[PDB]
Amino acid sequence: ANIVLAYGEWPEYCPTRPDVSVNRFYTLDSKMWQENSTGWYWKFPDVLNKTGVFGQNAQFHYLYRSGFCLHVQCNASKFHQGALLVAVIPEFVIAGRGSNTKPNEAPHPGFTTTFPGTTGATFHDPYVLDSGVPLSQALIYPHQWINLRTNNCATVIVPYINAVPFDSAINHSNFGLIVIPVSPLKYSSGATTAIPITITIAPLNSEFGGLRQ
């Protein structure tokens, strides 16, 4: 496989270091990609705030700094066809959809939309990335194409991208993942009507600070 190293920097240290039970392959549930699907996004440092030792050591602490090793498999048969675009986005701010210019009458995304959790969330307008920004140039980020006739896997080693070397892992999602079916799914009748997408992440080089019992 070919690894796209995000911004040419390896996740390095700078606080406790677990180094044993948090450097394991956390595997999220598979997403069923279909014909009329739109896309999916995941806010990362609050995907793993409910899963095991990393969630325990990220909720009971106050300072946090880590990188990530992503892995996105999408295993389909040799008769299906389509394409995915998997891309990480630093500081992925979800915009609100409306046409109101007043402060407390304009819409705003809820807590479940901004922080989806360990189950992700789907887009509403994937052409504008739900942020008023066209996705055609979204290749400016670190990204890979999951083309269902060349490969079925993608991997992104993403370092720590933040202005302050330590930040809260609960009230600030560092960066997001976005998978988008640019080319739709096509298949003849009699095949499997839905393709699973599996995501496994590894918290490389985790550092925690200021734990409140």
Report yes or no: 187 and 40 within 8 Å, Cβ to Cβ.
no
Report yes or no: 182 and 61 within 8 Å, Cβ to Cβ.
no
φ, ψ of residue 191 to 5 degrees: the values are: -100, 180
Per rule CB under 8 A, count of chain residues that contact other proteins: 75
**Sign of the torsion angle spanned by Cα atoms 110, 111, 116, 119:** negative
Q: Is 211 in the site for other proteins (CB under 8 A)?
A: yes
Maximal C-alpha separation, the chain: 57
Distances (CA, A) of 124 to 20, 132, 212: 39, 12, 39
Residues found in the chain:
213
For other proteins, the binding residues in 171-190 under the rule CB under 8 A are 171-176, 182-183, 186-188, 190
Pick from 52, 110, 132, 192: which binds other proteins (CB under 8 A)?
132
For other proteins, the binding residues in 83-102 under the rule CB under 8 A are 83, 89-101
Q: Is 36 in the site for other proteins (CB under 8 A)?
A: no
Q: Is 202 in the site for other proteins (CB under 8 A)?
A: no
Q: Is 125 in the site for other proteins (CB under 8 A)?
A: yes
- Of 20-28, 29-37, 122-130, 198-206: span binding other proteins (CB under 8 A): 122-130
The smaller minimum CB distance to other proteins, of residues 26 and 187, is found at 187
Q: Is 203 in the site for other proteins (CB under 8 A)?
A: no
Q: Is 116 in the site for other proteins (CB under 8 A)?
A: no
Pick from 30, 114, 155, 200: which binds other proteins (CB under 8 A)?
114
CA-closest candidate to residue 157, choices 2, 11, 1: 11
